[PDB]
Amino acid sequence: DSSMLISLTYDVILVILCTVYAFKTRKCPENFNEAKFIGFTMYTTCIIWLAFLPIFYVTSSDYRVQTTTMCISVSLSGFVVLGCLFAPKVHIILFQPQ
Amino acid sequence: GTRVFKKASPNGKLTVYLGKRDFVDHIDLVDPVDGVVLVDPEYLKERRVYVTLTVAFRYGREDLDVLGLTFRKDLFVANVQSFPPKKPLTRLQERLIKKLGEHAYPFTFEIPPNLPSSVTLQPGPEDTGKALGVDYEVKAFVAENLEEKIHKRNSVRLVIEKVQYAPERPGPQPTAETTRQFLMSDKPLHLEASLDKEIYYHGEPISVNVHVTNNTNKTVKKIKISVRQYADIVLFNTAQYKVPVAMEEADDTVAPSSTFSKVYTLTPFLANNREKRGLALDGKLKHEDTNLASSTLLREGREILGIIVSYKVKVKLVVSDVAVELPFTLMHPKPKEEPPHREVPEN
């Protein structure tokens, strides 16, 4: 777990930088406020990572719960990345093509 | 003694006469586009001639141009049947009818308020097409209604400019202040800035009084005073375009727990900003490279239409940073006779 966290600290800093950049430019109206969706995605990704990483470290007692948390974290991160950014874009593309 | 501007078709006898090339607005009312057309009796069944006033709006950015898309829309299109095979006339129109003859068919357009002024974005060397911005055009079609296609020979295209002038009331002078608390205990830094006036004419000097009160543990390195121009693009949700048309950096430092007042002179002009692609400038007819875009006045109690141009003097002090903005209007005054709308010395 310590080695995994050491490997993932680069991605943690990467997410922190992305969230900072998203917060810096939040009110960009391009593509129907795409910056707002990007910022929301970054905020909720930071929230879920902050709520997951200590949980992942502390659930080392049982392998089943550790693996479940590891899978659920990345799965929900993928669903966030899809449904907070591409989903409004897909809805505008398909449901409102005018 | 009065004179008008005449535009003639390449072929046939279709001449459009307009009294003035600038149709200004007074917020409450807009000067009507009044003109006349002479058309020879060369038609048998197509006894209908139409005049269209189009407030076209085009936009293109460097990234968009590279990608291959340029936004285009028609903000307001008005069609008037010039030939009546009601509608009060004016003295100028009556004089034009009397001088031209019986064939002089009048046409009058009442431009609705809350419409953007004629402002054209400055195009780069790569751009060689239609001018980017809001352009007002009058097009005369000698064809059976709008069903038939537009013919270049028949249609008469003339570019008109709708511009606003400085208001009678100068308005309160800008005075912007900002106090910042540093992270090191409670050490306040105070910045204040003021302008000589609120309404500014193009080419006139701008005097900014800046006063700094340092009660901190740091010394200000440099002071950057700039004249930012903002071009809000309501349509297509385009991001705001911000461009520094003039800048001045001062290396003077202010000691902590001390006061320092100074005056700075900034005179925006187009010669230094000629290389800034996408900059908004006054309306153009045949690429005369007019002055900077006059800051539109949103006196209406405020609609998201067209391009909204504004100017703000920004003062920034480093050692994060303290930034303050003072809005001001850079608009032309009312000309005595008329705006020539071209380089008065042609060569």
Contacts of A87 (CB under 8 A, 6+ apart): none
Contacts of B83 (CB under 8 A, 6+ apart): B39, B47, B48, B49, B105
Q: Which residues of B are annotated as a binding site for 1D-myo-inositol hexakisphosphate?
A: 242, 247, 314, 316
**Cβ <8 Å between A28 and B238:** no
Tokens of A10: 């680069």
Neighbours of B306 (CB within 10 A): 24
Identify the residue whose tokens are 């001390």.
B258
CA–CA distance, B332 with B201 (Å, rounded to integer): 5
CA–CA distance, B144 with B146 (Å, rounded to integer): 7
Contacts of B294 (CB under 8 A, 6+ apart): B117, B119, B163, B164, B165, B202, B282, B309, B330, B331, B332
CA–CA distance, A11 with B259 (Å, rounded to integer): 47
Q: Which residues of B are annotated as a binding site?
A: 242, 247, 314, 316
Identify the residue whose tokens are 């900034």.
B266
Q: What is the 3-state secondary structure (H, E, C) of chain B?
A: CCCCEEEECCCCCEEEEECCCECCECCCCECCEEEEEEECCCCCCCCCCEEEEEEEEEECCHHHHHHCCCEEEEEEEEEEECCCCCCCCCHHHHHHHHHHCCCCEEEEECCCCCCCCCEEECCCCCCCCCCEEEEEEEEEECCCCCCCCCCCCCCEEEEEECCCCCCCCCCCCCEEEEEEECCCCCCEEEEEEEECCCEECCCCCEEEEEEEEECCCCCCCCEEEEEEEEEEECHHHCCCEEEEEEEEEECCCCCCCEEEEEEEEECCCCCCCCCCCCCEEECCCCCCCCCECCCCCCCCCCCCCCEEEEEEEEEEEECCEEEEEEEEEECCCCCCCCCCCCCCCCC
Query: Nearest residue of B to residue A25 by CA position?
Result: B239
**Cβ <8 Å between B239 and A30:** yes
Query: Nearest residue of B to residue A35 by CA position?
Result: B239
CA–CA distance, B5 with B158 (Å, rounded to integer): 10
**How near does any CA of chain A get to the CA of B7, in Å?**
38
Residues 117-156 of B with CB under 8 A from A: none
Asked whether the beta carbons of B306 and B115 are under 8 A apart, the reply is: yes
Give B-chain residues touching A30 at CB under 8 angstroms: 237-239
Query: Nearest residue of B to residue A27 by CA position?
Result: B239
**How near does any CA of chain A get to the CA of B239, in Å?**
6
Q: How many CA atoms lie within 13 A of B347 on its CB side?
A: 0
The approach used to solve this structure was cryo-EM
Please give the C-alpha separations between residue A10 and each of A13, A40, B167, in angstroms, as whole numbers: 5, 21, 57
Q: Which residues of A42-76 are buried (b: 16+ CB within 10 A; e: fewer)?
A: bebbbeebeebbeebeebeeeeeebeebeeebeee
Q: What is the 3-state secondary structure (H, E, C) of B244-303?
A: EEEEEEECCCCCCCEEEEEEEEECCCCCCCCCCCCCEEECCCCCCCCCECCCCCCCCCCC
Asked whether the beta carbons of B289 and B131 are under 8 A apart, the reply is: no
Best mutation target, A24, A30, A92, A96, to test chain B (most B CBs within 10 A)? A30
What are A's interface residues with B at a Cβ cutoff of 8 A?
28-33
Q: Does residue B70 come out as left (phi exceeding 0), alpha (psi in the -120 to 50 range) or beta?
A: beta
Residue B134: strand pairing partners: B57
Angle (CA) B306-B312-B316 rounded to 5° is 140
Do the strands B156-160 and B71-81 form a parallel or antiparallel pair, or are they unpaired? unpaired
Report yes or no: B237 at the A interface, CB cutoff 8 Å: yes
Asked whether the beta carbons of B113 and B296 are under 8 A apart, the reply is: no
- The resolution, in angstroms to one decimal, equals 3.7
CB burial of residue B71 (10 Å; 0-12, 13-18, 19+): middle
Asked whether the beta carbons of B157 and B14 are under 8 A apart, the reply is: no
Cα torsion A54, A56, A58, A61 to 10°: value is 180
Asked whether the beta carbons of B31 and B18 are under 8 A apart, the reply is: no
Q: How many CA atoms lie within 13 A of A56 on its CB side?
A: 20
CA–CA distance, B59 with A78 (Å, rounded to integer): 36
Report yes or no: B239 at the A interface, CB cutoff 8 Å: yes
